């Protein structure tokens, strides 16, 4: 009856953390981040004994089936606690370039390890988009996500970052829009499916840059400049069409909004 413990600054974009309790690889949770667009060092996910016990081993399967975007951390360790404070390494990894999907990770020690807690802590850098399937110890309908957000001072910047729950063979144009309260969602930027052409709403136009990474899967908005009047939600989008990616009509696929707010 362990519980799950994780970086207070994710949020669920879907699936919901029981199904990483659930013995069931094949269901999940992928998370997002309303306030940056990368998991930093330090970020992490895994488990509340409850107890303590002597462990005798792990396995937890992060990624979650299918493709998609980037949807696990690069470099990363296990480590383990009495007490919730001081943590002690038991293995290092570097996953630097895998594909998407399930990675079962499982692990065992040949002299049990006493712990209360135990869990998966980022060392680098990462897209601000995770998934993960399971988190057991041994003892003897695309849909599209953005990440960042928040508030930040005028003349400042920030980066959102959006990510797919699947890959597909076509070549999507994707596009940022947003909303400011009670008035009409406008179009921002759009990029077509290989980068090469980009079109910017006036009232952004050499303040925001959009760019795309289709290794990562990635689509990014660089927020420069920042002016009071760029407080809105921003959604993501995609449209097989690069001519009608700015139209609200034009999109088949809409990401769930991040809250921007840029304060004097
Ligand atoms: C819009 N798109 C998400 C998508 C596309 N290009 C991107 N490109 C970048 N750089 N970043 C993204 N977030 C991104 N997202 C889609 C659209 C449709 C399907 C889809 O229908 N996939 C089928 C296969 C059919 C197909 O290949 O279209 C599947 O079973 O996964 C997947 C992703
Ligand atoms: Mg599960
Ligand atoms: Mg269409």
């Known amino acids: 009856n362990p519980s799950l413990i994780r970086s207070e600054s994710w949020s669920v974009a879907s699936g919901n953390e029981a199904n990483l309790l659930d013995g069931d690889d094949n269901t999940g949770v992928w998370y997002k981040n309303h306030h940056h667009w990368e998991s930093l060092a330090g970020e992490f996910i895994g488990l509340d004994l409850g107890k303590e016990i002597k462990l005798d081993g792990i396995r937890f399967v992060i990624g979650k089936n299918g493709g998609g975007s980037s949807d696990k951390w690069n470099k990363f360790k296990l480590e383990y606690s009495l007490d919730n404070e001081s943590w002690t390494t038991i293995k290092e990894y570097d996953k630097t370039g895998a594909p998407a999907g399930k990675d079962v990770i499982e692990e065992s020690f040949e002299t049990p390890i006493s712990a209360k807690y135990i869990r998966l802590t980022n060392l680098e850098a990462a897209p601000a988009h995770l998934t993960f399937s399971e988190f057991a110890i041994v003892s003897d309908q695309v849909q599209l996500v953005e990440s960042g957000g928040g508030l930040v001072q005028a003349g400042g910047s920030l980066r959102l970052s959006c990510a797919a729950s699947?890959?597909?063979?076509?070549?999507?144009?994707m596009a940022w829009f947003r909303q400011a309260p009670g008035k009409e969602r406008e179009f921002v930027a759009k990029?077509?499916?290989?980068?090469?052409?980009?079109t910017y709403g006036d009232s952004v136009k050499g303040r925001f840059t959009i760019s795309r990474d289709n290794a990562e899967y990635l689509v990014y908005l660089q927020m420069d400049s920042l002016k009071p009047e760029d407080t809105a939600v921003y959604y993501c989008?995609?449209?097989?069409?690069?001519?009608?990616?700015?139209?609200?009509?034009?999109?088949?696929?809409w990401g769930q909004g991040t809250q921007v707010t840029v304060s004097s």
């Open positions: 989008a995609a449209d097989d069409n690069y001519v009608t990616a700015s139209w609200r009509s034009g999109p088949d696929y």
């Open positions: 699947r890959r597909s063979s076509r070549s999507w144009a």
């Open positions: 990029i077509s499916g290989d980068g090469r052409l980009t």
